[PDB]
Amino acid sequence: GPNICTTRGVSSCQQCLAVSPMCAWCSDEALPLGSPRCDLKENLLKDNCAPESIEFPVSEARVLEDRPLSDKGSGDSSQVTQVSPQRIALRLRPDDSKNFSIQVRQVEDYPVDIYYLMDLSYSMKDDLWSIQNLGTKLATQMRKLTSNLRIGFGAFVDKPVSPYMYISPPEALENPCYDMKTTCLPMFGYKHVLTLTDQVTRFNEEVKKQSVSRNRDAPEGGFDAIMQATVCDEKIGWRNDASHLLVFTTDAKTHIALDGRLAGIVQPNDGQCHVGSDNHYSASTTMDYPSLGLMTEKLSQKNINLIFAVTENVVNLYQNYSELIPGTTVGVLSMDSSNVLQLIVDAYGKIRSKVELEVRDLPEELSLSFNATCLNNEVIPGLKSCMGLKIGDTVSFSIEAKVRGCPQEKEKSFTIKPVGFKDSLIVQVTFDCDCACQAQAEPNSHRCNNGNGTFECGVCRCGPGW
Amino acid sequence: LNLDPVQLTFYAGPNGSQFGFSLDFHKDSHGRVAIVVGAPRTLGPSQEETGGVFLCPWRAEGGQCPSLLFDLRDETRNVGSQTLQTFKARQGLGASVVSWSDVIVACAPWQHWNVLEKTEEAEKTPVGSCFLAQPESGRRAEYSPCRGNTLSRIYVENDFSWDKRYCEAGFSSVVTQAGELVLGAPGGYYFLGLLAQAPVADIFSSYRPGILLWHVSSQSLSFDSSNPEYFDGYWGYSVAVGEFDGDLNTTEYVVGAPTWSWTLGAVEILDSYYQRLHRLRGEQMASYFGHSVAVTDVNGDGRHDLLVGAPLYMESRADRKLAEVGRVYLFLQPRGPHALGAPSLLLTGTQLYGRFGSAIAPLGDLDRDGYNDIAVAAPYGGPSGRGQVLVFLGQSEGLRSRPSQVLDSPFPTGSAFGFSLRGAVDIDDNGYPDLIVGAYGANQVAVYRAQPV
Amino acid sequence: DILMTQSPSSMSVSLGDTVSITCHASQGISSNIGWLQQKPGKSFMGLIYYGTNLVDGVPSRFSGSGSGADYSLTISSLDSEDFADYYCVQYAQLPYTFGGGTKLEIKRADAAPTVSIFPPSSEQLTSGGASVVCFLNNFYPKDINVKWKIDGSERQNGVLNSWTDQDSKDSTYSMSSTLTLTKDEYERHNSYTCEATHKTSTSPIVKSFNRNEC
Amino acid sequence: EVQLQQSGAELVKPGASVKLSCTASGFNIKDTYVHWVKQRPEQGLEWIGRIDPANGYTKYDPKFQGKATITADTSSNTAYLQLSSLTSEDTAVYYCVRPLYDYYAMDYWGQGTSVTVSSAKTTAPSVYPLAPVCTGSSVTLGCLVKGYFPEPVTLTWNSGSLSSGVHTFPAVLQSDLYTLSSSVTVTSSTWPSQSITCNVAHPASSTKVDKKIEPR
Ligand SMILES: *[C@@H]1O[C@H](CO)[C@@H](O[C@@H]2O[C@H](CO)[C@@H](O[C@@H]3O[C@H](CO[C@@H]4O[C@H](CO)[C@@H](O)[C@H](O)[C@@H]4O)[C@@H](O)[C@H](O[C@@H]4O[C@H](CO)[C@@H](O)[C@H](O)[C@@H]4O)[C@@H]3O)[C@H](O)[C@H]2NC(C)=O)[C@H](O)[C@H]1NC(C)=O
Ligand SMILES: N=C(N)c1ccc(C(=O)N[C@@H](Cc2ccc([N+](=O)[O-])cc2)C(=O)N2CCc3nn(CC(=O)O)cc3C2)cc1
Ligand SMILES: *[C@@H]1O[C@H](CO)[C@@H](O[C@@H]2O[C@H](CO)[C@@H](O)[C@H](O)[C@H]2NC(C)=O)[C@H](O)[C@H]1NC(C)=O
Ligand SMILES: *[C@@H]1O[C@H](CO)[C@@H](O)[C@H](O)[C@H]1NC(C)=O
Ligand SMILES: [Ca+2]
Ligand SMILES: [Ca+2]
Ligand SMILES: [Ca+2]
Ligand SMILES: [Ca+2]
Ligand SMILES: [Ca+2]
Ligand SMILES: [Ca+2]
Ligand SMILES: [Mg+2]
């Protein structure tokens, strides 16, 4: 019986395939005049159409790279595979769809970078004293989770400019604790101290030489430090293939963008690195604090896992900021940072417990659907992220791609990457809208209206200009 | 809608002076409109930044402007066995300018102040100060209500209550129709913020050069508070006046507190006694709700309406992602004594990091249709990020949601085109109110003349 | 403390004159000075503050000047209400210190005193006391010296002198001098004299009486 | 209008204490500094001290350290001056002062409060007639008021009738008691032709004695 392939009354092989993914075309010469050459493939073979002259593309999906998921992330020059497969070829015809899958694994024994960014205003004096052995203590506990630990240190107070800074008497500039009975460092915005290293005793000895400063207003300039510790790749020392943990310890509110105007600072934050050979943030007094959106852009671009380790009075404040900066973790810090070791370990485990997929460079005509499989073989439709995972777990996602019609460019490719992961899946898409007989057409054909038309795929078509 | 974007008028100041950081229209005693321009980094006598003010006569060709001269010298007074000290270096004179009648008020928000008494001191702090000028007569006067002579030790004993040392008075400013100068001081009361009000006439009559500390009995300051919701709220970052209580004898104040309640931000409407009538809460933390405020009746019902800018508002987009674009809120004043409800309309920027809502300027009735209109600045908006100013026409239901006209910055990158705005004055006497736009990054001011529709 | 030397102590001037009062500090005070006025028998009324600034309401004929440690209060065209006391005060340092004061007085032609002596009354004598009163009425200028003599010899103990302010009609001065003795001591002597010395006469004006003899 | 209204005249004994009041009118006493100034005919004007009524902090000349104590009450809008261990040297007129504009100036003054320290008792005066000796064209009579306390005393002639040509001299303190004299001049044809009487009233002792001047 007639179907949508024949009732449409197509004019060429390309128009026939665009009707439905089930339609086929016969490019045979010896075909009856009343017989339509655009029908199901079963009906074409039923009318003695040559099997070689049958145009019938079938959407498929074959893997090109299928590296096995790594068991251990230790060793190797980062030959670790945590996304399988890594590349597939996807062939689609007009208005058609094809499915494929991807596995994501939280590899065990993965390298970790921990940069300790510490508020060093006056109320953090006691905190400095109780972390003098944090480097060796952190190495002991982190040794259970990873064999490639690197740690570093940086400190902040606020922008060294009135009214944040005490500018009187003259002695207060060199000793901000002058009008007290003690001595403290001159005020500083953000200073880098220790580049990320595996020599943990370097962390101890550097921390032992640090001391606090003193400024006037409760909110501090740690967001300046978060920005610089993020965009100064080479100075801080973040590794290409490791987890990046930025531990931000403070006990106070934070200054935000547009606060700088109270110090006469109006230039917006430019998102660049401004820490030179002296290891201080040279734009502290000439450039405004960064905004949450700018911090998010840089944290995402550098794959930094920001950790708000703050005291009880400002937990709710930083928990609310964290909701505006996706991927950020909050941990309750005690008044002397005596609990930060467990705070980091708890924060690290909470960081590797999520697996969320991200789609990059998806063609406009393409749409995707996801069925997640988390925990224990439980399929959750319409979901592309799992939660509550542990180090070593593995999840899988079923993905379907649907194309709207046939685009202009026949070959495009996009990426499916888990958030914060180095590895990803590349999908090379090929749009099969044409017929193989068009590449062997006959322009100005004698068979077609005295050389006025083109003979392609067994029919006559109007030539260019008609 | 009908601003002319082809034939603009450009005024210019010295390079690096931030000419155009603030601006206002100025009518002399004869009704001749000129443009007062603040340039808060103009060099002073010691080749050091102190700021400066310029008074630009209206010329279609624009060009250079004469100076509005002020005393830039530091003062020292040894009186009552104390030592009073003013510090004008980097004071930012011209960070705010405002005109009322034939008087110009230009403020130096970062002018510092200290009081020495033997080995003790009050601490060198940015109390701020404002300079007043009557250009035609040459009269000068000053106003610095946050100066004090209390020594540092006393504030520590009181846990820093009523601490006005860091006011930065003149950070924002406005004058009522009756001639009362109202200064925003976002650092007052240890960065809670405060307002300082005093009649311009009494500022002039009570001022003498050299005194530094003098009584302005008719002045009126807001009050300190122990409510933690106000701590570090910068109450007074922006200020404006209007009629919001149905009593045309009383003038009501509109104050911006962009970091109120742990950077949630707020805008408050008060009476002349600083008793709160309304509070508009921020929608999103760190969006800087209250960075700018504007008062004008948009829907032609005679009742003043409120506009709040939140330049750092992050719009929600696909895939659970945020995008900082900025947002402006419109509150229509209800009939009779009632609370301002939810926003009647939301305008949201489009360019990432554009800071839509950094400045909101009433235009008057630009197209002469019976409804007042506004202009909103995105100093880093537009497809090029060079800056954009957008015009929204009033209507019986409030404001149009789509802009009638978009002015692209004629200056290069970094000019901050739109950071300052002023409208609702017919500078060329053609019957249509016009618009002046500051671009302190390029040290210039652009004038847009409104034309017949 | 800062010493404020004011000059002159007094001056005799007329209506319309332009007079100046000077005030000298023991160190630089940089115009941290005020000027005060005190009309006869009334309270204080401030004239100048911070060297040169007129207090609200003060007429423009008053004007202050000077710097360092030397300042002046000038009054142009004196008015009848300007005849009063004037003071300077420094407030550069605590404690505040005032000048000595300057009194403006009405000038007129010199007039000799009218001297009258009075023996003790019968009432006072019967009670045990004896006062000899000597009135010196209506003279100019104010500088005058009274001398008592008992039997020709000077007497100085028991004298009580009282001077009036300048008269409002004739702008003269008067003086009362009372010598009080006991009744018994009064009767040890016979002659009682008061002598007035005034620049209107190189010789003293003498008035005397004799006890019992009348 | 700014006005400083001080408490009335005080008459106290040595060794006692007195407390002077200075109430603000037309303004809040909390607005400015409030000073106290002492005045005497010989020593002149002496600055006692000041107070900031907003916080109670004070400053004193060390000469009055112990004697004077300046306080203030914003409730009653009044400033005070307490003088203890009173002496004759404390007998003076005391003023309260506040500035106009300048924080440190001394522009607005109260009407002054008079303080008198004395052990003397309310003593009625002794009125003595002063008649001339036993000639010219004009004659001068006199009246002697001696040994009274306290001040003042009203003296007229013929019950205020005779007023022109009269000099009433300021009272003088003669050993804890006051003494005053008055003269009057007329023509020779008036006295003893017309009766001339000296009217003296001492309200403190409720006495109005009058002596007719009789010739000798
Ligand atoms: C961090 O972010 C959280 C989450 O928003 C903030 O917590 C919110 O703070 C608001 C301001 O205080 C609270 O609004 C109040 O809600 C009351 C009733 O509804 C509540 O619902 C929440 C949801 O769980 C519960 O916590 C509460 O127990 C209630 O059930 C209103 O009655 C209340 O009263 C009003 O006040 C507003 C002004 O705030 C007036 O406009 C109005 O007239 C009325 O008087 C108010 O609406 C909100 O409940 C609260 N949410 C939660 C979950 O706690 C933190 O404040 C943020 N902290 C920092 C430091 O940024
Ligand atoms: N109700 C009002 N209007 C009101 C509201 C808030 C305040 C206020 O904020 N007060 C300060 C007092 C103050 C000063 C100096 C120091 N100190 O020197 O340690 C410690 C505390 C305050 O409590 N701070 C919190 C913590 C802190 N630490 N620091 C030193 C550093 O962080 O370097 C500085 C701070 C600022 C005042 C008034
Ligand atoms: C995700 O799971 C859903 C079911 O939860 C799939 O939808 C069904 O697919 C089958 C295919 O044989 C149809 O017969 C059903 O009618 C579908 N159910 C619907 C549409 O409600 C979906 O195909 C899955 N997607 C992927 C990519 O695996
Ligand atoms: C597509 O889905 C079917 C089940 O509907 C499954 O059997 C098949 O393996 C999937 N294809 C790929 C490439 O995963
Ligand atoms: Ca601590
Ligand atoms: Ca700070
Ligand atoms: Ca009103
Ligand atoms: Ca309205
Ligand atoms: Ca309009
Ligand atoms: Ca016009
Ligand atoms: Mg701190």
Structure explained in plain terms:
With 466 residues, chain A is α+β, with helices and mostly antiparallel strands. Chain A is 19% helix and 27% strand. Chain A has helices at residues 4-7, 13-17, 41-46, 125-129, 134-142, 170-174, 200-209, 222-231, 233-236, 292-301, 315-324, 340-351; strands spanning 24-26, 38-39, 54-55, 60-65, 83-84, 87-92, 97-105, 112-119, 149-156, 190-197, 243-250, 305-311, 329-333, 355-360, 366-374, 378-381, 385-386, 394-403, 411-418, 425-431, 453-456, 459-462. Chain A has a six-stranded mixed β-sheet with strand order 4-6-20-19-14-17, with no helix packed on it. Chain B has 453 residues and is mainly β. Chain B contains four helices and 35 strands. Chain B has helices at residues 152-157, 188-191, 200-206, 260-263; strands spanning 9-12, 22-27, 33-39, 52-57, 76-79, 82-87, 96-100, 103-108, 112-117, 120-121, 129-134, 139-143, 172-175, 180-185, 194-199, 220-221, 238-242, 252-257, 266-270, 276-281, 292-296, 305-310, 314-317, 321-324, 327-331, 345-348, 359-364, 373-378, 388-392, 394-395, 398-399, 405-408, 420-425, 434-439, 444-448. Chain B is globular and about 65 Å long. Chain B starts with 8 loop residues before the first strand and ends in a 5-residue tail after the last strand. Chain C folds into two domains: 4-106, Immunoglobulins (Immunoglobulin-like, Sandwich), CATH 2.60.40.10; 114-210, Sandwich (Immunoglobulin-like), CATH 2.60.40. Chain C is built from two helices and 19 strands. Chain D is mostly beta strands and 216 residues long. Chain D has strands at 3-6, 10-12, 18-25, 34-40, 44-51, 58-60, 68-73, 78-83, 92-98, 108-109, 113-117, 126-130, 138-148, 154-157, 166-168, 172-173, 178-187, 197-202, 207-212. In chain D, strands 2, 4, 5, 6, 9, 10 and 11 form a seven-stranded mixed β-sheet that branches. Chains in contact: A-B, B-C, B-D, C-D. Chain B binds chain D through residues 79-80, 149, 206-208, 211, 213-215, 217, and chain D through 27, 31-32, 99-104. One calcium ion binds at residues 365-367, 369, 371, 373, 393-394 of chain B. Chain A: Residues 109-351 form the VWFA domain.
